[PDB]
Ligand binder design. Sequence first.
Ligand SMILES: Nc1ccc(N2C(=O)C=CC2=O)cc1
Ligand SMILES: [Cl-]
Ligand SMILES: [Cl-]
Ligand SMILES: [Cl-]
Ligand SMILES: [Cl-]
Ligand SMILES: [Cl-]
Ligand SMILES: [Cl-]
Ligand SMILES: [Cl-]
Ligand SMILES: [Mg+2]
Length: 346
Amino acid sequence: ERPTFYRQELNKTIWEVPERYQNLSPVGSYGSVCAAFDTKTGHRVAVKKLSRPFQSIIHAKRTYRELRLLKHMKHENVIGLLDVFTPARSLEEFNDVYLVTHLMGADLNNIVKCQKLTDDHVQFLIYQILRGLKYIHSADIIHRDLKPSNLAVNEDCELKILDFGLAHTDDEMTGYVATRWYRAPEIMLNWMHYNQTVDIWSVGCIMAELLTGRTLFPGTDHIDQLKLILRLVGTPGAELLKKISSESARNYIQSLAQMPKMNFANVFIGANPLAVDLLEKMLVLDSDKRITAAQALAHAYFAQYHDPDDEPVADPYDQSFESRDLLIDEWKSLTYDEVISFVPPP
Ligand SMILES: Nc1ccc(N2C(=O)C=CC2=O)cc1
Ligand SMILES: [Cl-]
Ligand SMILES: [Cl-]
Ligand SMILES: [Cl-]
Ligand SMILES: [Cl-]
Ligand SMILES: [Cl-]
Ligand SMILES: [Cl-]
Ligand SMILES: [Cl-]
Ligand SMILES: [Mg+2]
């Protein structure tokens, strides 16, 4: 049952993998990644070797979280797991974890910065993002890091969501950085407990950028970005203010002069009126009032692609491990069980 493994050193790293994976080629270094040819399936794949997966309790739990999430995702518009393996023959010698996915080429950044996008292209790209998000949200998963570099696109304009947020550093979110430009204001500023509605804010920012060719909220820091956001959508009323938990944050918001919501038709000049309407329903400051993924799929902007019989939901997903307090070797044994129980896709 166990395949034969072979060892090789590539760019100062030892790779020990099943014989089915051939012609390994480093492509980046979380972990290190190689492209390879999978002779069993005929696909070009990415093989990721995790770095120090069990070095702390925090790191061991994150390894388990990533493997559980990738094993669950089975949807045309979401990255899935082709294989997971370890050269260890027993739990006692278990130390390394390797993950195998389809090799991705272009991301949405390349399409946006380069090509000329018709409204038809925007419809199809945003439709596929929302189709994947309906699936993800139906399992009570929040992506939390949706942005153009985390969306893979091929020559036929087909799209996959990848790089789920496995929980970023403060330094990574500081300054003039794309890592913050797509984040909802309530999570950027820790206003309140957040939920899946943060992802719809991100879709609105991405859709705006496809329509204009320009970043919607390219702030030079957290406060500059908040000012750009409030100039477009308006300052909050008393209803949303009650929902912000920090007294200082509430005090700061009330220090700002009040501003009305702008006319989106005079911002997104020449856009399809149905695109403008959908943007007004995503980019809502109060997260309770944003449109959901399931509701957006039925919006008239997507009439040529919407098929309610081909927009599936996910199997239920048990996340109770997230509140569990375990030792390193307990998280490690749980991860080992999930490696050896993996069943490949058809
Ligand atoms: N700045 C800016 C650039 C482009 C746009 N635009 C749309 O939003 C849809 C067509 C179009 O040219 C709007 C503002
Ligand atoms: Cl093999
Ligand atoms: Cl996939
Ligand atoms: Cl090992
Ligand atoms: Cl990006
Ligand atoms: Cl005022
Ligand atoms: Cl489950
Ligand atoms: Cl421990
Ligand atoms: Mg990424």
